[PDB]
Structure formats: C-alpha cells, structure tokens
C-alpha cells in the first residue's frame, strides 16, 4: 500500500520546453515489491488515446499537455497498460509532472491529479499485479482436555 | 475496495476431531464492484493438495492441528503458484469455514486461526484503491 505526494514547482514564463518540471512527486511503499506504477488522472487527447491534457479552471480556460517524467521510469508502448513503471525495490521513488512537447501555455491555474501503487511481478503474467494489505482477522480455537 | 472479514469460532467437546467439522465460520464482504473473493490462512502448508494448512498450538510447534478452508462455491488452483481459495461471487458477502482436515486426535490447547482475504476483479487482480494526490500549478508570464 503506497503513499503518494505531489509538490508544485513554481515557474515564471510560459514558453515551456518539453521536459520542463511542473511538479515533483514521490511514491513510498514499505512492503516488499518489484517496483512502482504511477499515472496521471486526466483525459487523453484523441484516441490515440493521445497525450494527457489538463484544462485550466477558475479563470482562463486553456489546455496544457503533461506526462510523468524522471529517471528510471518506463512506459509500455503497446496500448492497454496505463501509466509509467519502474523496477525499484527500494522503498521510495521520485517522479515529476513534466511538460509534454514544446508549448506556449496560456497563463492560468492547472490542477494535476496523480495516482500510484507498488506492484509485485508475477510469473504466469498476469504481469504486474497491485499490492495492498489484505483484510485479516484471527480467532482462537480451544481443543478441550479429555478428562 | 478493501474486504471486511469476520471469523466466528465454534466450541466443541473433547479432542477427537472428525474430518469436515467446522471449527470456525468466516464471512468476507466487499461493498464495491468485484468478480469474486479470495481467502487464505496464514499458516504453514502440508502441500498435500490445496488450501490445506497446519496450525501450531499457542505453546509452540510441538502440537499441530490440520485444517482446510471449505464451503460450497470455493475453488483452488491445482498448481501451487496461486494460493488460497477463490469464488466467483459478485454479491456483497461470501461465507467460508475453517474445517478439520482429516480425522485427528488433537493435543488439548489453543490454536490460533489467522485468515486473510481480498475481493478481486477478473481481467494469472486484487482490488486496491490506489493512493491519489493533487497539486495546483500556476502558469504565468512576467509581463
């Protein structure tokens, strides 16, 4: 079961090169895992689907195209398997929200939503199944003496 | 999508435990959309067949109790790679039993049953609400 954080990165200017970091994220999992999986909660451009698109709110309403970035993160190219993956067995991983393609982005307020989990690689894929604490309970049974 | 699991112990007289006797009654709930349930015991395994288990008395491993998960509708995979028992119940709740596995003269004592479970989505996935977080970013120009 993962803990995820996302921290805005302030930036002056709107001629944004591809790769420019707009937020810094971290995912943590204490339990044993094969790696991490993170994704953006946003509509994708025309299917595609296309690049993650975020529309500004509470003011001018324009579009910004974003992706997850950072060393170690990989995306599966055959459609069907959403998000980015890494193979870090360590407990913590950094990722970024980055500008996806050179963009002159209109001034405004843009909300990034991301989700994430750790996964445990499975033979008989299956592939990578997510990793959460199962509900658990105990009961004690007494076997009585013979007498 | 976390399950809620209860386990009710049943009292019996004496230490001759016949195969199939229900030592505990379990119930597993999943209030969200799911294809079925999966349940297992956190105990060592005899590897006899499937879902079978060996529980030690609270005093230590010098005394064993052999048990299995039972109940209509529950299945286990024949290969060791996937553990526990599964069903294909889409309803909120599923009932299972911890049963005596084979006729046994059991050493008097206390035996702790630890049971875990999850609701799954058929797609070898468990239902785990992924952690989620937002941050707001302002785009602005100098002038």
Per domain, the residue ranges of chain A are: 1-147
What CATH code would you report for A1-147?
Answer: 2.60.40.1570
What CATH code would you report for B1-143?
Answer: 2.60.40.1570
Instruction: Quote the CA–CA distance of B139 and B39 in Å, as a whole number.
Output: 50
Instruction: Compute CA distances B113 → A31, B24, B84, whole Å.
Output: 23, 9, 14
Residue with tokens 């529309």: A55
All residues of chain A having their beta carbon less than 8 Å from the beta carbon of residue B12 are 144
Closest C-alpha among A113, A126, A135, A128 to residue A36: A128
Specify the experimental method: X-ray
Instruction: Quote the CA–CA distance of A143 and A61 in Å, as a whole number.
Output: 70
Q: What is the DSSP secondary-structure string of A58-111?
A: SS---EEEEEEE-TT-B--SSTT--SEE----SSEEEEEEEE-S-EEPPSEEEE
Closest C-alpha among A29, A42, A32 to residue A3: A29
Task: Give resolution, Å, one decimal.
Answer: 2.0
- Contact residues for B105 (Cβ-Cβ < 8 A; gap 6+): B15, B16, B17
Residues 114-143 of A with CB under 8 A from B: 114-117, 122-126, 129-132, 134-143
Contact at CB, B14 and A139, closer than 8 angstroms? no
Residues 57-116 of A with CB under 8 A from B: 64, 97, 105-116
């Amino acid at each position: 079961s993962a803990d995820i954080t996302l921290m805005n990165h302030k930036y002056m200017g709107n001629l944004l090169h591809d790769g420019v970091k707009l937020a810094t994220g971290r995912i943590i999992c204490q339990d044993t895992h094969s790696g991490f999986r993170v994704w953006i909660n946003a509509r994708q451009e025309g299917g595609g689907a296309g690049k993650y698109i975020v529309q500004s709110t509470e003011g001018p309403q324009h579009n910004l195209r974003i992706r997850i970035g950072g060393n170690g993160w990989s995306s599966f190219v055959e459609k069907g398997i959403q998000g980015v993956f890494n193979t870090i067995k360590e407990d913590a991983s950094i990722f970024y929200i980055e500008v996806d393609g050179n963009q002159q982005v209109h001034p405004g307020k843009y909300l990034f939503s991301v989700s994430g989990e750790c996964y445990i690689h499975m033979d008989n894929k299956q592939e990578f199944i997510p990793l959460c604490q199962a509900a658990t309970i105990t009961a004690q049974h007494t076997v009585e003496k013979l007498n």
